[PDB]
Symmetry: D2
Subunit: 261 residues, 4 copies
C-alpha cells in the first residue's frame, strides 16, 4: 500500500528513515507522500505533530506511527531499535487501529477560520490585558482576566495542559479540558480557578470585552488574529487514527515520561 515517512532532519533520523524505505522495497509497499495510507514520523513528538498538521485533510484514511530517535515520546512511542520489526508488521497488514479525539477551533471575525488541534489551542492577548467573557453553551459562565486560556485534547493533557495544573486524561475519553493562566482574583474579578472538562457536543465560546486582537496558538502554530468576534472550542467530529501492534498503555507512557523509565 501507499506510505510516506517524515524525518526530524538530523543525521540520526534520516539514516533511520532510509533504512525503512530500503526494507519497504522488499514488500508490496509503494512510497507516496501525496496519498499515503500510512504516515510514519521519525524524531520526536514535535516531528509527529508536524506530520499530523500536514495530512489533516484525510485523517480518517491514515494510520500514523511515531518513532523516537531521542527520549520517549507520547506519540513517538517506538524505539529506533524496533524499526525492522515495525516494517515487517507494517508491510504485512491486519494490524489493529486506534483513534484519539481531537479539538475543533472556530474563529469568527473576512469569513471564519477553522482549525484542528492534536494537543491544545491557547489564547492570549495582543499585548495589553487579556479579558474575555466565557460562554458555555450560550450561558455566560465567567469573565476571565489573566494571561490566557488553554483548551486541551485528552492526549494533549500531558503537554502544556499539565504545566498549567490541569489533569491528565486518558485519551479513550472523548472530552476537552480548559485551564487558566495566572488568573487574577480579587474582590472584583472572579474566575473558577479549577480546570473544566467538557464532554462531546459541549461548546465553549470566548468573547472579547475590549481588545479584539488575540494571539492564538493551534498546537505548534501561532498567529495573531485581528478583529475577533468569537472563538469556538468544541470536541471535533474527526479522530486521528493510530496503527498499533504491541500494547503501550497511555498510563505506562505517562509513567515513563514523568516518574521513571
Amino acid at each position: 500500500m501507499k506510505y510516506m515517512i517524515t524525518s526530524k532532519g538530523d543525521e540520526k533520523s534520516d539514516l533511520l528513515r532510509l533504512n525503512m524505505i530500503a526494507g519497504f522495497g522488499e514488500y508490496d509497499m509503494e512510497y507516496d507522500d501525496v496519498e499515503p495510507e500510512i504516515v510514519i514520523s521519525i524524531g520526536g513528538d514535535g516531528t509527529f505533530l508536524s506530520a499530523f498538521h500536514q495530512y489533516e485533510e484525510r485523517l480518517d484514511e491514515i494510520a500514523f506511527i511515531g518513532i523516537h530517535t531521542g527520549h520517549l515520546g507520547f506519540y513517538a512511542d517506538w524505539r529506533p531499535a524496533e524499526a525492522d520489526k515495525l516494517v515487517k508488521l507494517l508491510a504485512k497488514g491486519e494490524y489493529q487501529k486506534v483513534s484519539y479525539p481531537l479539538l475543533k477551533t472556530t474563529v469568527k471575525y473576512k469569513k471564519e477560520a477553522t482549525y484542528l488541534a492534536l494537543n491544545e489551542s491557547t489564547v492570549k492577548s495582543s499585548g495589553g490585558p487579556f479579558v474575555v467573557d466565557v460562554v458555555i453553551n450560550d450561558i455566560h459562565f465567567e469573565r476571565f482576566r489573566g494571561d490566557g486560556l488553554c483548551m486541551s485534547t485528552p492526549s494533549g493533557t500531558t503537554a502544556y495542559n499539565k504545566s498549567l495544573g490541569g489533569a491528565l486524561m486518558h485519551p479513550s475519553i472523548e472530552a476537552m479540558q480548559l485551564t487558566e493562566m495566572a488568573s487574577i482574583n480579587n474582590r472584583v474579578y472572579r474566575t473558577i480557578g479549577s480546570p473544566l472538562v467538557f464532554p462531546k457536543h459541549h461548546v465553549v465560546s470566548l468573547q472579547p470585552v475590549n481588545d479584539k486582537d488575540f494571539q492564538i496558538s493551534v498546537d505548534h502554530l501561532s498567529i495573531l488574529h485581528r478583529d475577533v468576534q468569537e472563538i469556538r472550542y468544541e470536541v471535533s467530529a474527526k479522530k486521528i487514527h493510530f496503527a498499533r501492534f504491541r500494547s503501550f498503555p497511555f498510563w505506562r507512557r505517562v509513567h515513563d515520561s514523568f516518574i521513571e523509565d
Copy 2:
C-alpha cells in the same frame, strides 16, 4: 406510586416536608420508606447524601429529587418555593430521568468489603506516615508519600476534589478522578502531582508498603480499616437515577455555586 421524604431535622425542612405529604394525598401517591420509587430529600447536599446512602441497594429503581432549604446545592437544586409545582409534576408521571456515574470501592484484608460513593472516597494513614504503592491496571505507577489520596466521581468533583486542585468534570462523562494530598516530592520520592482521570473499566489499586492501617472515607462515612492488603477504585456499574423536569445544567449549577448566583 410509592415515595418517601427525607428531612434535615430543623423546623424549616420538616414544615416543608409535611406540606408535600399533605399535597401528595390529593393524588395517587402512597407513602413508603421501605420500597419507594421516588426519594425526595429536603435540606442540603448532606441531606441528599444520607438519602442516597440509605437506599443504595435499589439505586436502579429510584429517581431522587433534592430541595435546598438553605443555599443552592449540587444535588439539592430545587428552591423551596417551587415545592408545590414539584408535587404536581411528580405525582403525575411521564418525567425525564437522569443517571450519574458512581465509584465502586473494594477493600481487601475477614472477607472483603465493598462501597458505593456518590461524591468521593479518600484514604489517609492511621497516624504515622502515609505511604502506598499505586497500581494502575496491574502496573505499578508510583509510590505516594503524603497525607492521602482522593478518588472522586464526576458529580463529586465540585466537593473535596475541587479543594485538592482537581478538575471539575461534567457528570455525563463515565469516569473517575484521583487527586493528591500534600504530596512530598524530593530527590527520593516522586509523585505525578497532576490529577488523573480514569475511564470506565479502568482499575486503580492502592497497596501498603509498611503500615497496613488506613483511615478510609466513603462520602460522609469514615472508618479506620485494620490489616488492609488492597484498596480497589473503579467506576461502578450502578448509576444513581435522578428525576428531572426543567433543565438545570451542571455548568450553570457550577456558576451559581462559585462565581455568583
Copy 3:
C-alpha cells in the same frame, strides 16, 4: 514646601486634583513637578505606579501619597472623601514616613542597563521556547524551561506574584521573591516549583542557554532585549518613602482587596 499631583486623566480625578491645589494655596505649599518633596497620585495603583516611575531618580527625597478614585488600591489607599483632611495634615508637616523595599534589575549584553521596580520584573522568551540557567550567588541552581519567571518586591506580592501561586509578603521584610510560570517538569527537566524568597544582598542571575532575546518587563514597562548575556535580580539599596498619617496595615489592605471590604 514643594509638591506635585498626578492624575488618571478622567473627569473624576482631575476635578479632585484641582480641589487639592486650590486648598494648597491656603497654606505654605509651592507647586513644583520638577523638584517636589511630596508626590500625590490620584486614580489607581497604576496611576501611583507611573508617579513612581517618573521621580525614581530622587526616591530618598520624596514621600508619596496615593488616592483611589475607584476601588481601593494597595498604594492608593486613601478614599477621595478624605482629601480635604489630607491637604490639611499634608501642608502642616510633622508626619510619619514609611519606606518599602525595591528590586534592582541589571541587564548585561552596548553597555548594561539598570532598572528599579516597585512591583515586579518578569522575563519571557522572544517567541520560541524560554530556557534559562538560574544561578544563585554564583551557584547554578536549576535550568528553567517554561513561559518565564517573575521576581517580586514585598509590596508587589499582591500583584502578578499572587497570580502565579506566590506568597504574600509583608513589606517590612527586606526581601525579594521568585515565582515560576507554567514550568514543564518531566524525566528530563527539573524546576524547584516552589517560590523562593531571597534576603538582602542575595543575588539571583539568569543566563541564556540558546535564545539570547528575552521580553523583559519592569512593572508596567516591557521591552524586548536583544543579545542578552545576563539578568541580575537583587534587593535594591534604595527604598520608596511613603507619607503616613492614620495607620492602614498591609494585612487589612490585603483583607479589603481579596476577602471583603
Copy 4:
C-alpha cells in the same frame, strides 16, 4: 568542654557515634548529656529534630551539629566520611556560630501551654469540620474552612510547608509563614488561598467558631487539645544556634535535596 551525641539507634549510627566519643577522649572534651555545650546528632533530620526538642530549655547555650548517615538532610548536612575532621575542629574551638529563627506557639484554654517549633506547627480538627476565625494583630482576617493550617519557620519551609504550595524562605529572614490545607472556597466561604509571611512581632491568632477541640502538631509531636479558646502563632524570641565550619549555603542544600545531588 561538655558535649553529648544523639543517635538514630541503628547499627550504622551507633558505630559512627562511638568513633567520635573515642576520638573525643584524645582532646579536652567531657561527655555530658545533662549540660552539654555541643549537641551532635547522627542519623537524619528526624534525629536532629529530637535532639532539638530535648535541650530546648537552653537553646542559647548550645551549638548543634547534624550528621546524615543516610541521604542528605537540611539540618544533618555533614557526611559521615567527614566525622573525623569534625571532631578535630569541634574539639579545638574558635568556630563560627549560626542562629536560625523559631516559632512560638501559645495555646489558651487549665492554664495555657507554650511550644517551640523548629519546623512547623499545624492545626486540624478533632474529627468533624475544621472551621476557625483567623485574627492577625487583633484584626479578623478570614474564616478558614478546610483540613487545617500550618505555620512554618524559615528553615521549616522545606518540610511540610513545601508540600502545601508554600514558598521556600532563606533562614536568615526572621519571619513565619502560614499555608492552607484543602481550603474550600465558594459563594459562601472565602480564604485568601495565598501563603502569608509574617515578620517579627507579628501575632497570628486562631479562634474557634463551633468545635473547640483541635489536633495540634508541634514538629513531630502531635496532641489533641480539648476546650481550646485560642492559638497564638508568633516568631519566637529564642533562636537555635548552629556550629559551622565550612560554608554550606541553604540554597545549595535546597538544590541537592530536590534538583540533583
